[model samples]
Target: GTEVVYRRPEARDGTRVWELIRDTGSLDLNSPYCYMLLGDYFNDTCMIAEHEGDIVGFISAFRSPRNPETLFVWQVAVASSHRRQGIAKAMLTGLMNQKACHGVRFIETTVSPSNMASRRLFLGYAEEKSIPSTVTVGYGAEMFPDGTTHEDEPLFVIGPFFNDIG
Candidate 1:
């Protein structure tokens, strides 16, 4: 297995990031332009993972404007071939250690009820840090224009801990 390297995303990485999301086939694919904004403007809070010179993972996040203390992870994707290698968790750890996340005390992300994989990732991180993890009503299915076709997106919050990454 090749070693995975983590780094902050750059503008040039936008397309690859967009493609990675699309290839995941599980995450909601947004416009490539949206990803460009993340690399150009939200780069401070976003991260990428590379393996053998290819992007294998990407995490899109931003510090809440109203609540600077919270880091909201918008999306996380690990290539199908790289699953079960702890890449996702490593990306989260790297994101938290970034200088831009210096004072962040909480991590937030919405996960659909059936997405157990994501639920476990966030909740498991909380357990690893021995911190409290909470799930609250985020966006109800009825709130979406698609109605019940979209699952309820409940928010997962993990935090109130120092940046002791040891």
Candidate 2:
């Protein structure tokens, strides 16, 4: 059954979110409480993909507190069984297309320098949306503790991608 649906997450989705993010691998996992908060309070900024009543994809995003015009995507995850189907990109597109995003002028995210999949995802989204974009060093290794294996996180920003009502 290809019964996939995308919508804002609810507080009850916390545990499933944790499971998907944990099982996705490579993502720096956060506490279940944090996931619950994101689901409850930031649901407008998050997107959850359910297939036959099971969560298969999730996107964690928030409107920047300091920059009202930007929506910063914290992380994206898709179940391994659902990979390569463009579910991640589709969920992202669906989120930004919502009425709540009407005032959002930009989309941003940080990608480890070597994470080519993420790098392409944002860039490709920008292209699909016809939004001007850029990638710059958002956080350098120097920001981390000494002797750490941390890598640079380049910020991928798309937009001034605005809504039509404006």
Candidate 3:
């Protein structure tokens, strides 16, 4: 039960959120996913969730490159230690409320099908699922803060919701 503080992130916040996503050894960051997410912050609001001066979680959402009617949820992560603390919900809720995103009807996200936590959380928000994806997590390994590595991860899609409702 962590009550999080939500805010519109400055460009500098991207690095902070990325650090959380990067330092999270449990995730396979080498999967080409990280850089794509970072790209969303090029000139937009990068939402962040903080607790105790730490970026516990973040989601970099923006207009879809191809379909403006559709918005993209670039990346979202709750530091491994902070999982199950409602950080993800808080972040998504904030994104749904952003003034610039008004009238945006759909938000798409991706999550590993094997991630039981994500499966359950998404379900609660009226989210749907698809067959297990064969998406190969490229990059082979993640670069950890302490300089460690991770391997063989799987990723799948989630979202395209009416709103990121909690």
Candidate 4:
């Protein structure tokens, strides 16, 4: 009987979102100020999940400025305690269902090869919706600064589907 509530994130929720990302130990943790800006200005494309009044999940996304029909998901983080409960998928769905995403026809994100969980999530989402997914070169390890070991992040594109909100 787990009741999880999903809603748009506000500026005040940024700190909690930052903490959640830091705790994940998987996703790259960005500055708290960056998260605050996301919550305040990018609230329309972002989402937060709560269980029993505690923040448990967060998804940060934005409509691509160059391609208005594309929604670029930047990050997805879920608390260790709530990993297996489908909260990540639910948050993605909730974001798509929002009015701000009304005309979005595609979804895009970059995932590293080692992050099989995220690869599965996006591919499975496209499969569930009967849409097509394509993967191409996104960012190479060489794209990072010298002395930093970073994996290649292949781009995942899921799209050409009608938005649920429109």
Best by TM-score: 4
Better of 3 and 4 by lDDT: 4
The candidate scoring highest on lDDT is 4
lDDT of 1 at 13: 94
Q: Model 1, range 15-89, lDDT digits (tens) per residue?
A: 999999999877888999999999999999999999999899999999999999999999999999898899999
Cα displacement (Å) at residue 118, model 2: 1.3
Worst 10 residues of 4 by lDDT: 157-166
For candidate 4, what is the total of clashing residue pairs?
A: 0
Worst 10 residues of 2 by lDDT: 157-166
Report the lDDT of model 1 for residue 28.
Answer: 80
Model 3: ten consecutive residues of lowest lDDT: 127-136
Candidate 1 residue 16 C-alpha distance from true site, Å: 0.8
| lDDT per model vs. reference | 0.91, 0.87, 0.59, 0.92
TM-score of each: 0.93, 0.91, 0.64, 0.95
Candidate achieving higher lDDT, 1 or 4: 4
How far is 4's C-alpha from truth in model 3 (Å)? 2.2
What is the RMSD, in Å, between candidate 4 and the native fold over all Cα? Answer: 2.4
- State the lDDT of candidate 4 residue by residue for 43-161, as single tens digits: 99999999998899999999999999999999998899988899999999889999999889999999998888888889989999999999989998899889968899889989889
Q: Write the residue-wise lDDT of candidate 3 on 68-99 in tens digits.
A: 66566656678877888777776766676777
Write down the RMSD of all candidates, one decimal each.
3.0, 2.2, 7.2, 2.4
